[PDB]
Design a protein around this ligand. Structure first.
Ligand SMILES: O=c1ccn([C@H]2C[C@H](O)[C@@H](COP(=O)(O)NP(=O)(O)OP(=O)(O)O)O2)c(=O)[nH]1
Ligand SMILES: O=c1ccn([C@H]2C[C@H](O)[C@@H](COP(=O)(O)NP(=O)(O)OP(=O)(O)O)O2)c(=O)[nH]1
Ligand SMILES: O=c1ccn([C@H]2C[C@H](O)[C@@H](COP(=O)(O)NP(=O)(O)OP(=O)(O)O)O2)c(=O)[nH]1
Ligand SMILES: [Cl-]
Ligand SMILES: [Mg+2]
Ligand SMILES: [Mg+2]
Ligand SMILES: [Mg+2]
Ligand SMILES: [Mg+2]
Lengths: 124, 141, 138
């Protein structure tokens, strides 16, 4: 169905797909970050999103950033009921120092289909 | 539509959803753990789970822990057929020693719906729009 | 229903499995130093079935014993190139991957392909902006 979103500021960019059948919607940064080596930043999208029923939005890493700059994505479980600013938890591993500019595609968002089951205790 | 669990000891805590439409059931540590900086640990829940069909259980990181304490979850693929202790592999990437107390919610379990496809070898695959495109080919901006 | 693959070289091994993942086999030998990464080639190309992507996921044995993790991991339905496994070596030791070692697994994650629609404001929820620990520690 529909991935509804709203901007929270002029700095936000609409999620965009890299190709017709890309799994993820790229998420852009709303600000500049300087993230030191072996550090973490919570990067802001300045968007709230409303995920379709029966899924959640998984923040996943891009492969170019992972493979080329040693960037990972922490956290990344966006719940169907979350109406706040979507944050991307980025990990800068390895040497150097990762530089994020406003408008940078730093992750991607996937509508992972899940169950919400009732839980029931019974008796590598 | 039903996630079955059994307690493996008296130190287990029934998993619980943080909100009405939370993607994950939070998993509780069964023991005290001290994870040094740049180190890992398999945290025991002391529960066994029977996931419902057509899904597996992904052990996923919580965002407070990752944002505030630089904690990640490694591994994470609980198979539908697994009946042992559900273990949470925590990575402490922070400079801090991280203290896990018995009863702390240190991860969440998501029932990811999946296919169980048959694998078939073909001689060559056909081209598409993406093609061999990948690893930052579409760019940064 | 069906996962099609073709070998891109004689060094590829057919993935193998109610396991959620088909284990992916390295095509070559790699040495990954401490606190470093590598793109390990499988030398296979895949055609995932519709309505799913292929997530490259870590195996728990290599994670628990050797501090191995998988970065990236989003194989799109329309990708036709060499499936590459981005291995992260967070351990203090160098990690030796030999050709034929199962270094990852591939999961066919069912997903939606929704249309993106900008609205002025969204419906509200109980959760609301709560996130990043707002439900507490225990
Ligand atoms: O990468 C993320 C992960 C989570 N979040 C927000 C959205 C999500 O709905 C909310 C809760 O995420 P988790 O349940 O994964 N984290 P945690 O359990 O720490 O937060 P809470 O106690 O509120 O449930 O935090 C982000 O903005 N970015
Ligand atoms: O985070 C995890 C990951 C796996 N496990 C357990 C449950 C799972 O069904 C079992 C197998 O997981 P993987 O296949 O992902 N790892 P590996 O391939 O190393 O183990 P095995 O060879 O037995 O399949 O390990 C956990 O308890 N926690
Ligand atoms: O772990 C991975 C991730 C991606 N890939 C390939 C397949 C995927 O379809 C393609 C692009 O994947 P991502 O979109 O996740 N990475 P990125 O967005 O940087 O590449 P691109 O800009 O081309 O989309 O790269 C791998 O082989 N292994
Ligand atoms: Cl949402
Ligand atoms: Mg992409
Ligand atoms: Mg939560
Ligand atoms: Mg396995
Ligand atoms: Mg990861």
């Amino acid at each position: 169905m529909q991935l509804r979103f709203a901007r929270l500021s002029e700095h936000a960019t609409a999620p965009t797909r890299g190709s017709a059948r890309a799994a993820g919607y790229d998420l852009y940064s709303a600000y500049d970050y300087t993230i030191p080596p072996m550090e973490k930043a919570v990067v802001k999208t300045d968007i709230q999103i409303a995920l379709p029923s029966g899924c959640y939005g998984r923040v996943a890493p891009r492969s170019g950033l992972a493979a080329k700059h040693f960037i990972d994505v922490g956290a990344g479980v966006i719940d169907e009921d979350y109406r706040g600013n979507v944050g991307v938890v980025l990990f800068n591993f390895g040497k150097e120092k990762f530089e994020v500019k406003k408008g940078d595609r730093i992750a991607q968002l996937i509508c992972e289909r899940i169950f919400y089951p009732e839980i029931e205790e019974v008796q590598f």
